[PDB]
Amino acid sequence: FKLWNGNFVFDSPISKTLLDQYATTTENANTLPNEFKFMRYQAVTCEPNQLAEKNFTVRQLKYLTPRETELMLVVTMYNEDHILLGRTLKGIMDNVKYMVKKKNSSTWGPDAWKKIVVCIISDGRSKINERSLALLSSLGCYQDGFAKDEINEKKVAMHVYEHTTMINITNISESEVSLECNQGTVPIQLLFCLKEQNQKKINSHRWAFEGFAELLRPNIVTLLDAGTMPGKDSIYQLWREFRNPNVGGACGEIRTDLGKRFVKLLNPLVASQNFEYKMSNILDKTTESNFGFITVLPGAFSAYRFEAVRGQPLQKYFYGEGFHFFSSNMYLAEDRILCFEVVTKKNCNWILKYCRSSYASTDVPERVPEFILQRRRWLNGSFFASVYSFCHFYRVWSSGHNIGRKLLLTVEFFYLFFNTLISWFSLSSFFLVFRILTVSIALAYHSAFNVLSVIFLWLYGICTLSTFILSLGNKPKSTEKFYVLTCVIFAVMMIYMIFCSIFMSVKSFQNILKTEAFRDIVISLGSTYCLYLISSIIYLQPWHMLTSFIQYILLSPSYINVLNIYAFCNVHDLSWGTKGAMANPLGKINTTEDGTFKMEVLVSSSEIQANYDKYLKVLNDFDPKSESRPTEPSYDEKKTGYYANVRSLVIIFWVITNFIIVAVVLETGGIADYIAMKSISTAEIPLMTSKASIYFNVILWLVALSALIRFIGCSIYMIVRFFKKVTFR
């Protein structure tokens, strides 16, 4: 063969069984376009940054009339099953089919399938699922065979497969995938590109944004994840948000999958997450979109404009530039930095908008060990992305917005840090609320309320201590039975804490009709629970305020005492290092010959004496006077020693600054003794002071105050969207 400009570009045909299916579609089975009956293979053996410099090309450039690209759909995966992968492909194909049948459109039409380009980017050739790859092979986009790993002393970086198929999935069952090819199917051009070795996930986005997108030059770049299934017309609704030239990014809403006939609602750990997803798409995202800055939830469905993300925003996302705090830990925020660098771009004005008429369902974990490992990634990233934004809020004023937008963004950057500070102090708030409430009901009614207030404290301190020891030196998959018991214990504590307040409040009412507990039934149940229901009704989805609202309350104590403790003890996921310097000089003959053969035996007396004097000389030049610097750690074992130091300094500052709040309200830590000894000179300790009644009201005023802003923000968004709908109708 004659390789093309130093590159191995091969062109193979397809199976005979597959071509016959395509032949039935046309009205004359004699000829077919070359794009429908071939599969271009090529090896890259270079970097994604210099893909266009090494005379590399894609299949879209070399046409009689060059094709333009309007949407580039990226779909990353890593050893997912062949059922999770099919769900995303089925959702993608239906949207493309929908966008073809549009009658009146200046962009889309009956020949609009030449714009969308699907791009699957797998990770690792030895880690991809065996069954998932067979699904791609059944679509005509994979052929076993050519896997050249090197070309002229150049290891290949990644393999590129590409083909324009005409088979789209019809129905995904629980154990089967239905494939069909009829007159009502649209062709989908695939660009399956498989990587060689495992390189995390940020490198996968580097192969797309800096790689193929640099050759195709699309308008919009949409990000997906294997498992997420877009809706019937979710692709089209998200594309309509770029009508005005100010938007530089968008995302829809994400929903949980309830199985078949709503069967997955009996699980207390699935119904709990069904209420948390709803309350995040109704109270938080709308309020963030009002100002003009949003952060996409993990697993969601997002799209960026390729003109906005080009240059500085992409330079500080991939590389980001030692061992400095804001440069070495910045990978923990995932892509939340990309959303922040777009709004604050110099001499430009881009805003992020939240679309509501585009949804994407997904599955959720149903076991406890698997559910803890997932939130570990979310919490560590949502905590660092708000500390980075607050310390760099001055960069908004160097942008190109007007005067109103800058002031509106500065307020939101403070309102987010206030929410972060509330969540940082939530470990010492729950204990104080639990302790000032059980004691206060024992000083008023006695009876059996005196022993129950001592059993629950010891049952709390034992479960809290065991979570710190099992998170610093153990895995959550080994000891699975203990976490379930801890969750049940916390749920029971929550039930008792709820009952005590109702009892005290009803007694207070009966003793004044026939105060800390008087306004406790007025602000924590009348102004917090009512606004949630009103906001849900306004959002026109009021069917989750009774379905799965009880289960979320019982698992509330396990969101701040089992999930925050594990997420802070595992920040960087270090691995130290073993290595080893095996003796390179080895394999001295094999003596395979049974006998006779003597090989080479040194008998040279002079050589023997030279060797003996060569070992005798080593003991001479030993003087340690010039003490050389000890062998410093490489670079891979010295960076690990830095991740272990910035992680032990966060656990200490999180425990010490939370115990100070407890030793100012409860007068623990030896402070009450100090007052008593000061009072015995000019001698006893009260059980409860007056500082436990001021604090018990402040921590409940902030809870209902933060639920008041989320209602005004949710209502303004709907009011504006209703007028937009009326005007555009």
Add this chain to the structure above:
Amino acid sequence: FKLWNGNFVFDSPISKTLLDQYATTTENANTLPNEFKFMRYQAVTCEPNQLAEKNFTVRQLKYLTPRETELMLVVTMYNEDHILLGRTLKGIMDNVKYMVKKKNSSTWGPDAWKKIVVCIISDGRSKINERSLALLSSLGCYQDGFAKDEINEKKVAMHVYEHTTMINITNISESEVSLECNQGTVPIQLLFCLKEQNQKKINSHRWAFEGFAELLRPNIVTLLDAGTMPGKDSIYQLWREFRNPNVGGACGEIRTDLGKRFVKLLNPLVASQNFEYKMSNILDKTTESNFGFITVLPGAFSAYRFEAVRGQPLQKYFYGEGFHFFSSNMYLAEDRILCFEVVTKKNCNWILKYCRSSYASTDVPERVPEFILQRRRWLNGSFFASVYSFCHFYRVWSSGHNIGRKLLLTVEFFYLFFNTLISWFSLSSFFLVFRILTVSIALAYHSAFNVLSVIFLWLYGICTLSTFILSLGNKPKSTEKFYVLTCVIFAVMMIYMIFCSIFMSVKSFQNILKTEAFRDIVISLGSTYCLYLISSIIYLQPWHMLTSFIQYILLSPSYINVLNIYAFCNVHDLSWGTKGAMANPLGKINTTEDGTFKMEVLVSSSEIQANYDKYLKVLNDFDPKSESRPTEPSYDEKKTGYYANVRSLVIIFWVITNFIIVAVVLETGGIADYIAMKSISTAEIPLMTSKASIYFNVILWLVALSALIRFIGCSIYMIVRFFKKVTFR
């Protein structure tokens, strides 16, 4: 060559420069015995258990008159310097020289160097120090060259080098080693045997006890360690302990090296360990030897009788037989099991005796991070070896002792467990002593004693919490500067605690001459410190009660709060597992040809269709109805999950059972509130109760009581030895 019975046995000569030195010794430089001018090499390529079964042999068996062995000295090492190795060899050579000049002896004499056989067992061929091996090469016991790694599809297990040298070291300086060969030097038979791959240290003892010792068949087997230097005649004095046939093992005493002209006494961390070594060889070892059961200190100098340790004692030391508590953690006790299985041997009667006229000096750590990592091995082994002995104390009565010895051993097995229980509860004892003493001086004199009692509690709780976080998820070599600060803080706390007691006691005396603090200067300073001095004077080494007694007191709080915390959080030294299943099918050509060459390209349409059909068939047979058992952990990654579970269960039971003692004396943990609420029905909390004065005397009575037994035991041993000396004179 004609290999011997399936074994590669080669015989090389020595360097010409080395033979000339030997030639000067004899009175006729014409001939020399073959043992003095050759070096036998052999590869083992088998197991130590079956060394004699594969027709293997040593150089001592094939003589005109077979030689018998009286002492087999084992010297293990692992990447030690060439100065530490020379110190042991110089000490060994001087003892052999001393044992030759004895005039009247029925065993030793002028030709007694044929009995002692030195055996150096290095570990790892790629880990041995390159400079230390040159010292062996300069002795005529190593030749670079033949290092065959395989023979007829059989990997070599270990390499055997052996030669009878005649050069002994004269003086070891700080940077040089002096070698000489004169008329007053004795030959030493070396058996340097170098291992192939790193296999810990228990395997090294298996190569000796089950290996060479099975062919040489010695009388006594002495154990050493590179770095330990025996005394002038320490070998001979330890051999005299086997005169009577009841002894089945012995050991001497170990001392610290004070450098040159006592220069290493200025270090507070070296002087502290100088007083701990003395108090262990004067109060503990003598008392244990009185009963008849002793445990050798780490790094010491011990000897066993090969007849006593043969069979069951060696079968349960190496193998010891699942995942059971007393079978999987038994490797933590090192060789302390061997000492226990000798005394309780079935139908036999062996006792362990402690010799006092044989010493061996060694170096000690002088940095803090290096000192913490060493005691981590000692504490984890001395705690498990006493729990195993107490739960199996019934095995003494099945032995062959008389009636008195069984009763004497049963008492000692309880007295050791009592000492272990005292040390298990030492975390909550120091805090109680520190807290009941600083508060009590603030309720009597006020002034500045009210603020100092609150600063020290907060300064204690911050240093105690940071030691649990830095030991469960960090290495002690990284954060070196924090441990030094923690030690200084604890030392200052100790000084303040000492001053408070003296102040209170002198006030108590002055207020009765012109009670908890009255007998506090009578039992904790009059009956504890005096008995130490009396025992030291009786031992005839009373020069360490003022030299390094102050430094040991200041570092006393750091022996139970920095060393016990780190030793319990790191019990098994687990490493989890990474592994990885790299794609075995790989290496798809190299395409090295610049052009033209097409190699093999499949174009077979039928084969292509068959391939497409075999990838299409995988999606068919997928039915998950028969849910197979998930892939269980191998055996190496499942055992690690068991070591992590038995280690988190020890840290929890050590913290919970120590906080209960604090919540019964100080009435913390919510218990005082319970009493107050019970008292408000039929309402305040006292600062100090009467249980803090009963406990403060009990914990000081046990301290001076345990120092009273160690004096009687130390005196009885010396009284008996004096009569033995008088009778044997």
